[PDB]
Each structure stands twice: as C-alpha cells, then as structure tokens.
Amino acid sequence: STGSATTTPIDSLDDAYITPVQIGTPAQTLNLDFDTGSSDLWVFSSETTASEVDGQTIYTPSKSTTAKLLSGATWSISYGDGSSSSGDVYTDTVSVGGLTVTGQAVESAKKVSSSFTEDSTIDGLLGLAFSTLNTVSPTQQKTFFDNAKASLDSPVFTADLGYHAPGTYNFGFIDTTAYTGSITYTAVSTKQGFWEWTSTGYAVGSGTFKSTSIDGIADTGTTLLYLPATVVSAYWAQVSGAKSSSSVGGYVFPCSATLPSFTFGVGSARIVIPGDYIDFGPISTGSSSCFGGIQSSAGIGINIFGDVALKAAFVVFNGATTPTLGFASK
Q1: Catalytic: which of 199, 261, 296, 297?
Q2: Are residues 135 and 63 in the same domain?
Q3: Are residues 183 and 153 in the same domain?
Q4: What is the dihedral of CA 294, 300, 302, 307, to 10 degrees?
Q5: Which residues of 260-298 are buried (b: 16+ CB within 10 A; e: fewer)?
Q6: DSSP sequence for 33-46
Q7: Is the peptide bond before 138 cis (omega within 30 degrees of 0)?
Q8: 106 plus 194 within the same structural domain
Q9: Residue 324: exposure state from Cβ atoms within 10 A (0-12, 13-18, ≥19)
Q10: Active site residue 14
Q11: Where, by residue number, is the active site?
Q12: Is-contact 106 91, C-beta < 8 A?
C-alpha cells in the first residue's frame, strides 16, 4: 500500500504545515500538523474544554462507528516551544492520502495550552518520530507510520515541504520525479527517539564549506533551523545590520537586507537553503526589522533541522530495520 497527501502552510510565513487526515466512520477530516519530532497523534475533540476551543475542527468519537475508548489510558505532552496538551485515548480508523490504518491510537485532548487554542488552523498533531516517545500511559501506543509500516510497499515516508507553497507527504514509496540529482542517505540514531543524524558541515553564501560534525534532528514540526551558536554567528556576520536581540529573542536584521544562502552537508552532498527562506518577516506588524530563520540552538539542548532546512530538500525517512535519512535537492 501507499499514501500521498498534500501539506499546506498555515500562513504566509510557513510557520507550520497542515495535512488533511480522515478519522473515524464516516470520516471526520481534521487538519493535522505532521511532526517528525514527536510521536503522539492527538486532536481537538468533543472532550476538549470548551473555553479552550477557538475555531478548530473537532473530532467527535461518539459520531464514529469505529471509535473505541482505550480504557484507563491517558496522555500528556509538552513540546519544546513550551506548549502542552493532555487527555484520554481512543482507537479509530485513520487514513492519510488513501493509506488506512485500523486501530490507530487517536489521543483526544481534554486540555490544550493557549498557543494551540489561539491557532485556529491546526486541529491537532500527527507524530512521526519513533514510538518510544509516545506519551500514552500505562501502555505506549504506536505512531501512524509504525502501524502502517508492514503494509507499505517500502517502509518509508517522504517529506517534500514547499517554500510559501504546498508540498507533499508520501508513504510507502519514493517519487523519483520530485527531486533533482540523487538522494544521499545518512545514518540515524534512534537512541533519543528522534530522527537524529550528523550533518557533515556548512557554508555561508559562496564561502568555502566547513567540514564539521553537527548532530541534530530532522523535525517537520519545528519552524526554524537551530544550530550551534558558532555556526549561527558565522552566518549572521555576513548580513549587514544583523544582531542578536535578547528582547526579541533571536537574530534580527534589516528587512531590506539581502540574505546569503546557507548550505548544510549530508555526507559528501550539499543542500543549499536560499537566502529568501531565511527571512521570517517583520518582528511585529509594521516593523522594518525582520526575524531570522536560522537561530542558535544553545539552550534547546539539541540542534534542529526544522522546516527552514527541510523545505530546501526532498527528505526520505527510511524506517527500515536500520533507519536512515535521505536528502535530495529539488
């Protein structure tokens, strides 16, 4: 089997991407944030505290002939941006782009933090990290990908995120028309539950490539690219007027500045992030000061190849017995 679904930016900055997911019988379509940095599929629902629901589409398990309550099960998650959600657990039929999993754990939110409430466009998350990070208790549940794996033509999914445009999540096959050149594959560590890998270095604009190991995770659920402070300083030093602002919370630059590209290494291959991708617009409405798309990971505890990086590539998440990541230009 395979599946193919279009993923769409939630706003003009590519702050996140949403993908329609069919849940239950008859289908209830919710727009979920596919997150390769977490492992819970959770949704706004008929059970979510009413005051915490503001425009999202909710899952109503009582209207689904295939929903089943997982007795006694609870879940609770906290994300790196400090947002959180929690509730109880159903299993139901879940389809993504034509690919159907029966008995998928669908985590129903009883509570969500304000950032979720305030974001009307995201109806929940669908985690695609390794199932070891799933927060369901007393018994951890498997991700959509993990449940689908054995059925897939090939045990893979691919992320083809768009720059200010829609893109594609495919399951079970590699679309050889979706990228230029070849895919370079690189080893993954699952020790922390993430798609963790080691980049082979970076370049700033037309500068020479610096060979250096950068451990990090491929995370579709993070907006920006977070790298060591040394690397990030090297980049912004090449932008006239750029500075790190503690009040704003990161590197900012004159909106009229021309940004250099940023290259990261995948083995002996190179992915180039165009300068434009690194502009996340005014720090506040009407400002001539803009927020940078490359920021320091210092304080996060991990480097994160988020959407700014991933959208410059066609990315293969290879869930074979020994997992790997593949990157191609496109």
Answers
A1: 199
A2: yes
A3: no
A4: -40
A5: bbbbbbbeebbbebebebbbbeebeeeeeebbbbbbbbe
A6: EEETT---EEE-BT
A7: yes
A8: no
A9: middle
A10: no
A11: 35, 199
A12: yes
CA distance 251 to 233: 9
- One domain, residues 222 and 191: yes
Q: What is the DSSP letter of 189?
A: B
Q: How far apart, in whole angstroms, are the C-alpha atoms of residue 212 and residue 198?
A: 9
Look up tokens 């080893």; give the residue. Answer: 187
The last residue of one of the domains, among 174, 203, 226, is 174
Counting every residue written for the chain, the total comes to: 330
- Which range of residues forms the domain containing residue 297? 175-330
The DSSP string of 38-78 is ---EEE-BTTS-GGG-SS---B-GGG-TT-EEEEEEEEEEE
Number of Cβ within 10 Å of residue 63's Cβ equals 12
User: Which two structure tokens, joined as six digits, stand for 57?
Assistant: 């589409």
What does the alpha-carbon distance between residue 222 and residue 216 come to, in Å, rounded to a whole number?
A: 12
Single residue among 174, 192, 213 that ends a domain in this structure: 174
Number of domains the chain is built from: 2
How is the beta sheet containing 279-282 ordered, strand by strand? 243-245, 250-254, 289-292, 279-282
Is residue 183 domain-shared with residue 162, that is, in the same domain?
A: no
Tokens of 263: 């290259």
First to last CA, the chain: 25
CATH number at residue 190: 2.40.70.10
Given 14, 35, 88, 146, the catalytic residue: 35
- Determine the 3-state secondary structure of 232 from DSSP: helix
> Which residues touch 310 (CB under 8 Å, ≥6 apart)?
159, 161, 218, 219, 220
Please say if 288 is a catalytic residue. no
Main-chain phi, psi angles of 309, to 5 degrees: -80, -50
